[PDB]
Amino acid sequence: LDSVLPPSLYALVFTLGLPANLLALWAAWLQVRKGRELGVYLLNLSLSDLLLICALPPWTDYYLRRDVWGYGPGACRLFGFVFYTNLYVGAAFLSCVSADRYLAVAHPLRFPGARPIRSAAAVSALIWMLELAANAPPLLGEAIHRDRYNHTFCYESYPLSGRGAALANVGRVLAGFLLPWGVMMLCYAGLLRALRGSASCEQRERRRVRRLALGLPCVALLCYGPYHALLLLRSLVFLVGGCALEERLFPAYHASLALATLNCLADPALYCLACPGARGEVAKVV
């Protein structure tokens, strides 16, 4: 069985990501102190990572309680809200970073155009507001349940509430994963296609950019694929044996979130440890 796995992984994510995410926070702010458009997007991605890291400790006890809530009678909507909203916001800002890089590379002569910090912060605040307003129906004190024995996981629905309400998972799958991930696909593919004519960079730089721009989307997919795959499968079938399907597909779905939480530790490594300047800032921190 796997009731040690999730919480142990969460601890590994806390203990390592949270310091590394603070360091990435400082690196992003010292980057944006010079007027870097990518700085605000990196800042917000690190912010979401910190929010996941700080929301994890309730989930640790939650699991250790064999999924039945112990922390609060009703205070769990907040923790579910922050967890899921960060889960979506991280992908959104990954997409924004990819788009910024694509516009910087493909059209170096026409982007940025007017004090990009202002428009970038506008887009960032719009993403935050829209994600919060899209996750609001998922945490307001609406539903909670228990079926057999000590099974009251916060705001879960085994089985799904019904085809008239099960479409929240489908909407989240399409508009929280597929759209940002497809945007990153197109943006990094366009970046590689624009790098083709550069007389300057040799193979040693084109192939490095190829590893970077076809290795970060791969990590994002590896971290945010199983969760949305299981969710989409569950919801799509439930629209269309349901009992036995929920029985079999529960213990792997609940451990796919352990893989999803690895993105909040992988993103600093792929966006701070990759850049030499952020390594210099880290050497300044000590």
Short mmCIF file of all heavy atoms in Angstrom, two decimals, residues 199-246, unseen atoms left out:
data_model
loop_
_atom_site.label_atom_id
_atom_site.label_comp_id
_atom_site.label_asym_id
_atom_site.label_seq_id
_atom_site.Cartn_x
_atom_site.Cartn_y
_atom_site.Cartn_z
N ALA A 199 23.31 33.30 -37.59
CA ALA A 199 24.68 33.05 -38.02
C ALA A 199 25.65 32.98 -36.84
O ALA A 199 26.77 32.50 -37.01
CB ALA A 199 25.13 34.14 -38.99
N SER A 200 25.23 33.44 -35.67
CA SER A 200 26.14 33.63 -34.54
C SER A 200 26.39 32.32 -33.80
O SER A 200 27.52 31.84 -33.73
CB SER A 200 25.57 34.69 -33.59
OG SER A 200 25.48 35.95 -34.23
N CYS A 201 25.33 31.74 -33.23
CA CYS A 201 25.49 30.59 -32.35
C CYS A 201 25.85 29.34 -33.13
O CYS A 201 25.27 29.05 -34.18
CB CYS A 201 24.20 30.37 -31.55
SG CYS A 201 22.70 30.30 -32.54
N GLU A 202 26.81 28.59 -32.60
CA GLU A 202 27.25 27.34 -33.20
C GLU A 202 26.28 26.23 -32.80
O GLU A 202 25.21 26.48 -32.23
CB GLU A 202 28.68 27.02 -32.79
CG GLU A 202 29.74 27.86 -33.49
CD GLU A 202 30.09 29.11 -32.72
OE1 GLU A 202 29.84 29.14 -31.49
OE2 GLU A 202 30.62 30.06 -33.33
N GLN A 203 26.65 24.98 -33.08
CA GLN A 203 25.84 23.86 -32.63
C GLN A 203 25.83 23.76 -31.11
O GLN A 203 24.83 23.33 -30.53
CB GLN A 203 26.34 22.56 -33.25
CG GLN A 203 27.85 22.40 -33.22
CD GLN A 203 28.33 21.23 -34.06
OE1 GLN A 203 27.53 20.42 -34.52
NE2 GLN A 203 29.64 21.14 -34.26
N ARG A 204 26.92 24.19 -30.47
CA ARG A 204 27.02 24.08 -29.02
C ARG A 204 26.04 24.99 -28.29
O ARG A 204 25.75 24.74 -27.12
CB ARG A 204 28.45 24.39 -28.57
CG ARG A 204 29.51 23.56 -29.27
CD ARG A 204 29.45 22.10 -28.84
NE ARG A 204 30.04 21.89 -27.52
CZ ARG A 204 30.18 20.70 -26.95
NH1 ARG A 204 29.77 19.61 -27.58
NH2 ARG A 204 30.72 20.60 -25.75
N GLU A 205 25.53 26.02 -28.95
CA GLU A 205 24.51 26.86 -28.35
C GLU A 205 23.10 26.51 -28.81
O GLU A 205 22.17 26.55 -28.00
CB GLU A 205 24.78 28.34 -28.66
CG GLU A 205 26.06 28.87 -28.05
CD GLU A 205 26.03 28.88 -26.53
OE1 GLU A 205 24.94 29.10 -25.96
OE2 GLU A 205 27.09 28.66 -25.91
N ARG A 206 22.93 26.14 -30.08
CA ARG A 206 21.62 25.71 -30.55
C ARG A 206 21.16 24.46 -29.82
O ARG A 206 20.00 24.36 -29.42
CB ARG A 206 21.63 25.47 -32.06
CG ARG A 206 21.80 26.73 -32.89
CD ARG A 206 21.60 26.44 -34.37
NE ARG A 206 22.60 25.52 -34.90
CZ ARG A 206 23.78 25.90 -35.40
NH1 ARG A 206 24.10 27.19 -35.43
NH2 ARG A 206 24.63 25.00 -35.86
N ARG A 207 22.06 23.49 -29.64
CA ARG A 207 21.65 22.27 -28.95
C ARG A 207 21.39 22.52 -27.47
O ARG A 207 20.50 21.89 -26.89
CB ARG A 207 22.70 21.18 -29.14
CG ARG A 207 23.88 21.24 -28.20
CD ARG A 207 24.61 19.91 -28.17
NE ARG A 207 25.20 19.59 -29.47
CZ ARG A 207 26.18 18.72 -29.66
NH1 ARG A 207 26.69 18.07 -28.62
NH2 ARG A 207 26.65 18.49 -30.87
N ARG A 208 22.12 23.46 -26.85
CA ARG A 208 21.82 23.81 -25.47
C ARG A 208 20.45 24.45 -25.35
O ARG A 208 19.67 24.11 -24.44
CB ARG A 208 22.91 24.74 -24.92
N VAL A 209 20.12 25.36 -26.26
CA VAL A 209 18.78 25.96 -26.26
C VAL A 209 17.73 24.91 -26.57
O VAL A 209 16.58 25.02 -26.11
CB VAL A 209 18.72 27.13 -27.24
N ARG A 210 18.09 23.88 -27.33
CA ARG A 210 17.15 22.80 -27.63
C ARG A 210 16.87 21.95 -26.40
O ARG A 210 15.72 21.56 -26.16
CB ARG A 210 17.69 21.95 -28.78
CG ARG A 210 16.75 20.90 -29.30
CD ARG A 210 17.29 20.32 -30.59
NE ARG A 210 17.17 18.87 -30.66
CZ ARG A 210 16.28 18.24 -31.42
NH1 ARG A 210 15.44 18.93 -32.18
NH2 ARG A 210 16.23 16.91 -31.42
N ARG A 211 17.91 21.63 -25.62
CA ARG A 211 17.69 20.94 -24.35
C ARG A 211 16.84 21.79 -23.41
O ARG A 211 15.94 21.28 -22.75
CB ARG A 211 19.01 20.58 -23.67
CG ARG A 211 20.11 20.06 -24.57
CD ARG A 211 20.05 18.55 -24.75
NE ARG A 211 21.32 18.02 -25.22
CZ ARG A 211 21.45 17.13 -26.21
NH1 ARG A 211 20.37 16.68 -26.83
NH2 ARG A 211 22.65 16.70 -26.57
N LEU A 212 17.13 23.09 -23.34
CA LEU A 212 16.41 23.96 -22.41
C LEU A 212 14.94 24.09 -22.79
O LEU A 212 14.05 23.96 -21.94
CB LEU A 212 17.07 25.33 -22.33
CG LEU A 212 18.10 25.56 -21.22
CD1 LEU A 212 17.43 25.47 -19.86
CD2 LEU A 212 19.26 24.58 -21.31
N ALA A 213 14.66 24.35 -24.07
CA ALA A 213 13.30 24.66 -24.50
C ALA A 213 12.48 23.44 -24.88
O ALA A 213 11.29 23.58 -25.16
CB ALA A 213 13.34 25.64 -25.67
N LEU A 214 13.09 22.25 -24.92
CA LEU A 214 12.35 21.00 -25.04
C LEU A 214 12.60 20.10 -23.84
O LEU A 214 12.43 18.88 -23.92
CB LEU A 214 12.69 20.28 -26.34
CG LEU A 214 11.93 20.72 -27.60
CD1 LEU A 214 12.45 22.05 -28.13
CD2 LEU A 214 12.00 19.64 -28.67
N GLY A 215 13.02 20.69 -22.72
CA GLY A 215 13.22 19.94 -21.50
C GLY A 215 12.40 20.48 -20.36
O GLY A 215 12.05 19.75 -19.43
N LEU A 216 12.07 21.77 -20.42
CA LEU A 216 11.23 22.40 -19.41
C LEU A 216 9.76 22.03 -19.63
O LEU A 216 9.07 21.66 -18.67
CB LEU A 216 11.42 23.92 -19.41
CG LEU A 216 12.52 24.55 -18.55
CD1 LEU A 216 13.83 23.78 -18.66
CD2 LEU A 216 12.72 26.00 -18.94
N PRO A 217 9.23 22.12 -20.86
CA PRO A 217 7.88 21.61 -21.09
C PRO A 217 7.73 20.13 -20.79
O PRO A 217 6.66 19.70 -20.34
CB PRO A 217 7.65 21.90 -22.58
CG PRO A 217 8.55 22.99 -22.89
CD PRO A 217 9.77 22.75 -22.09
N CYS A 218 8.78 19.34 -21.02
CA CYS A 218 8.72 17.92 -20.67
C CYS A 218 8.58 17.74 -19.16
O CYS A 218 7.80 16.89 -18.71
CB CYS A 218 9.96 17.20 -21.19
SG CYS A 218 10.01 17.00 -22.98
N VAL A 219 9.32 18.52 -18.37
CA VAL A 219 9.19 18.44 -16.92
C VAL A 219 7.80 18.87 -16.49
O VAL A 219 7.18 18.25 -15.62
CB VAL A 219 10.28 19.29 -16.24
CG1 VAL A 219 10.00 19.43 -14.76
CG2 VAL A 219 11.65 18.65 -16.45
N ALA A 220 7.28 19.95 -17.08
CA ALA A 220 5.94 20.41 -16.74
C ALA A 220 4.89 19.35 -17.04
O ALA A 220 3.98 19.13 -16.24
CB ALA A 220 5.63 21.71 -17.48
N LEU A 221 5.00 18.70 -18.20
CA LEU A 221 4.07 17.63 -18.54
C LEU A 221 4.21 16.45 -17.58
O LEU A 221 3.22 15.91 -17.10
CB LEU A 221 4.29 17.17 -19.98
CG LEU A 221 3.36 16.06 -20.49
CD1 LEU A 221 1.91 16.40 -20.19
CD2 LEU A 221 3.56 15.84 -21.98
N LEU A 222 5.45 16.06 -17.27
CA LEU A 222 5.67 14.94 -16.36
C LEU A 222 5.09 15.23 -14.98
O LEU A 222 4.64 14.31 -14.29
CB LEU A 222 7.16 14.63 -16.26
CG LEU A 222 7.61 13.32 -15.62
CD1 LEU A 222 8.89 12.83 -16.26
CD2 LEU A 222 7.80 13.48 -14.12
N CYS A 223 5.07 16.50 -14.57
CA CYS A 223 4.57 16.84 -13.25
C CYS A 223 3.07 17.12 -13.22
O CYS A 223 2.45 16.91 -12.17
CB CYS A 223 5.32 18.06 -12.71
SG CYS A 223 6.99 17.70 -12.15
N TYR A 224 2.48 17.56 -14.32
CA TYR A 224 1.06 17.91 -14.34
C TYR A 224 0.25 17.06 -15.31
O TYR A 224 -0.84 17.47 -15.73
CB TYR A 224 0.87 19.39 -14.68
CG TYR A 224 1.20 20.35 -13.56
CD1 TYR A 224 1.14 21.72 -13.76
CD2 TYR A 224 1.54 19.89 -12.30
CE1 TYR A 224 1.43 22.61 -12.75
CE2 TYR A 224 1.83 20.77 -11.28
CZ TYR A 224 1.77 22.13 -11.50
OH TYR A 224 2.06 23.00 -10.49
N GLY A 225 0.74 15.88 -15.67
CA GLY A 225 0.00 15.01 -16.56
C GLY A 225 -0.84 13.95 -15.88
O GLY A 225 -2.02 13.80 -16.19
N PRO A 226 -0.25 13.17 -14.97
CA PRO A 226 -1.04 12.13 -14.30
C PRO A 226 -2.27 12.65 -13.57
O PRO A 226 -3.34 12.03 -13.64
CB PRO A 226 -0.04 11.48 -13.32
CG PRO A 226 1.29 12.11 -13.58
CD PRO A 226 1.20 13.00 -14.77
N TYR A 227 -2.16 13.79 -12.88
CA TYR A 227 -3.28 14.29 -12.10
C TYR A 227 -4.47 14.62 -12.99
O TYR A 227 -5.59 14.15 -12.76
CB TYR A 227 -2.85 15.52 -11.29
CG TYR A 227 -4.00 16.21 -10.60
CD1 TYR A 227 -4.68 15.60 -9.56
CD2 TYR A 227 -4.42 17.48 -11.00
CE1 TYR A 227 -5.74 16.23 -8.93
CE2 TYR A 227 -5.47 18.11 -10.37
CZ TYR A 227 -6.13 17.48 -9.34
OH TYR A 227 -7.18 18.11 -8.71
N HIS A 228 -4.23 15.41 -14.03
CA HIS A 228 -5.31 15.78 -14.93
C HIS A 228 -5.77 14.61 -15.79
O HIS A 228 -6.94 14.57 -16.17
CB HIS A 228 -4.89 16.96 -15.80
CG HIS A 228 -4.52 18.17 -15.01
ND1 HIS A 228 -5.41 19.19 -14.76
CD2 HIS A 228 -3.37 18.52 -14.39
CE1 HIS A 228 -4.82 20.12 -14.03
NE2 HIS A 228 -3.58 19.74 -13.79
N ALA A 229 -4.89 13.65 -16.07
CA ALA A 229 -5.32 12.44 -16.77
C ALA A 229 -6.34 11.66 -15.94
O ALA A 229 -7.41 11.29 -16.43
CB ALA A 229 -4.11 11.56 -17.10
N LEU A 230 -6.02 11.42 -14.66
CA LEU A 230 -6.95 10.71 -13.79
C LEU A 230 -8.25 11.49 -13.61
O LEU A 230 -9.34 10.91 -13.66
CB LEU A 230 -6.30 10.42 -12.44
CG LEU A 230 -5.49 9.13 -12.28
CD1 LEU A 230 -6.39 7.92 -12.49
CD2 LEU A 230 -4.29 9.08 -13.20
N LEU A 231 -8.15 12.81 -13.41
CA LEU A 231 -9.35 13.62 -13.22
C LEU A 231 -10.23 13.60 -14.47
O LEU A 231 -11.45 13.44 -14.38
CB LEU A 231 -8.96 15.05 -12.86
CG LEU A 231 -9.93 15.82 -11.96
CD1 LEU A 231 -10.07 15.15 -10.60
CD2 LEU A 231 -9.49 17.26 -11.81
N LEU A 232 -9.62 13.76 -15.65
CA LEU A 232 -10.38 13.76 -16.89
C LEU A 232 -11.01 12.40 -17.14
O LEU A 232 -12.17 12.33 -17.58
CB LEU A 232 -9.47 14.15 -18.05
CG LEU A 232 -10.15 14.43 -19.40
CD1 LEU A 232 -11.00 15.68 -19.33
CD2 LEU A 232 -9.11 14.54 -20.50
N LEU A 233 -10.29 11.32 -16.87
CA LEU A 233 -10.85 9.99 -17.03
C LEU A 233 -12.06 9.80 -16.13
O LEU A 233 -13.13 9.36 -16.58
CB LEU A 233 -9.78 8.93 -16.74
CG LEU A 233 -10.17 7.46 -16.80
CD1 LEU A 233 -10.62 7.07 -18.20
CD2 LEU A 233 -9.00 6.60 -16.34
N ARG A 234 -11.92 10.14 -14.85
CA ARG A 234 -13.02 10.00 -13.91
C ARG A 234 -14.24 10.78 -14.37
O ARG A 234 -15.34 10.24 -14.46
CB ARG A 234 -12.58 10.47 -12.52
CG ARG A 234 -13.61 10.24 -11.43
CD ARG A 234 -13.13 10.80 -10.10
NE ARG A 234 -11.88 10.18 -9.67
CZ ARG A 234 -11.14 10.64 -8.67
NH1 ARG A 234 -11.51 11.72 -8.00
NH2 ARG A 234 -10.01 10.02 -8.34
N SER A 235 -14.06 12.07 -14.67
CA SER A 235 -15.20 12.90 -15.02
C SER A 235 -15.83 12.46 -16.34
O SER A 235 -17.06 12.40 -16.45
CB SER A 235 -14.78 14.37 -15.10
OG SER A 235 -15.91 15.21 -15.30
N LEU A 236 -15.01 12.13 -17.34
CA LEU A 236 -15.54 11.74 -18.64
C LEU A 236 -16.34 10.45 -18.54
O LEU A 236 -17.41 10.33 -19.15
CB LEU A 236 -14.41 11.60 -19.65
N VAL A 237 -15.84 9.46 -17.79
CA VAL A 237 -16.60 8.23 -17.61
C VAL A 237 -17.89 8.52 -16.85
O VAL A 237 -18.97 8.06 -17.23
CB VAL A 237 -15.75 7.16 -16.90
CG1 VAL A 237 -16.61 5.95 -16.60
CG2 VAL A 237 -14.57 6.77 -17.77
N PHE A 238 -17.79 9.30 -15.76
CA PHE A 238 -18.97 9.55 -14.93
C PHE A 238 -20.06 10.28 -15.71
O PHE A 238 -21.25 10.08 -15.43
CB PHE A 238 -18.57 10.36 -13.69
CG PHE A 238 -19.54 10.22 -12.56
CD1 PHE A 238 -19.33 9.28 -11.56
CD2 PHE A 238 -20.67 11.02 -12.48
CE1 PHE A 238 -20.22 9.14 -10.52
CE2 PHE A 238 -21.56 10.88 -11.44
CZ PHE A 238 -21.34 9.94 -10.46
N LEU A 239 -19.68 11.13 -16.67
CA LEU A 239 -20.68 11.69 -17.57
C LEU A 239 -21.35 10.59 -18.38
O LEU A 239 -22.57 10.61 -18.56
CB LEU A 239 -20.04 12.73 -18.49
CG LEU A 239 -20.94 13.61 -19.37
CD1 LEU A 239 -20.25 14.93 -19.69
CD2 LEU A 239 -21.36 12.92 -20.66
N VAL A 240 -20.57 9.62 -18.86
CA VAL A 240 -21.10 8.56 -19.70
C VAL A 240 -21.90 7.56 -18.88
O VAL A 240 -23.02 7.19 -19.26
CB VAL A 240 -19.96 7.84 -20.46
CG1 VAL A 240 -20.50 6.62 -21.20
CG2 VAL A 240 -19.28 8.79 -21.43
N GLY A 241 -18.37 -0.17 -14.57
CA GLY A 241 -19.04 0.16 -13.32
C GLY A 241 -18.42 1.34 -12.61
O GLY A 241 -17.22 1.34 -12.33
N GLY A 242 -19.24 2.35 -12.31
CA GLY A 242 -18.72 3.54 -11.65
C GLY A 242 -18.17 3.26 -10.27
O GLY A 242 -17.10 3.77 -9.91
N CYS A 243 -18.88 2.46 -9.48
CA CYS A 243 -18.42 2.11 -8.14
C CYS A 243 -17.04 1.47 -8.18
O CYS A 243 -16.10 1.92 -7.52
CB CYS A 243 -19.43 1.18 -7.48
SG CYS A 243 -19.14 0.88 -5.72
N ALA A 244 -16.90 0.41 -8.99
CA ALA A 244 -15.62 -0.29 -9.07
C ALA A 244 -14.54 0.58 -9.69
O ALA A 244 -13.36 0.46 -9.32
CB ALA A 244 -15.80 -1.58 -9.87
N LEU A 245 -14.90 1.45 -10.63
CA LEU A 245 -13.92 2.36 -11.21
C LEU A 245 -13.37 3.31 -10.16
O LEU A 245 -12.16 3.55 -10.10
CB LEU A 245 -14.52 3.13 -12.38
CG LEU A 245 -13.57 4.10 -13.09
CD1 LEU A 245 -12.24 3.42 -13.40
CD2 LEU A 245 -14.20 4.63 -14.35
N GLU A 246 -14.25 3.86 -9.31
CA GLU A 246 -13.78 4.70 -8.22
C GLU A 246 -12.92 3.90 -7.24
O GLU A 246 -11.92 4.41 -6.73
CB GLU A 246 -14.96 5.34 -7.49
CG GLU A 246 -15.82 6.24 -8.37
CD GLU A 246 -15.05 7.41 -8.94
OE1 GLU A 246 -14.10 7.89 -8.28
OE2 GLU A 246 -15.39 7.86 -10.06
#
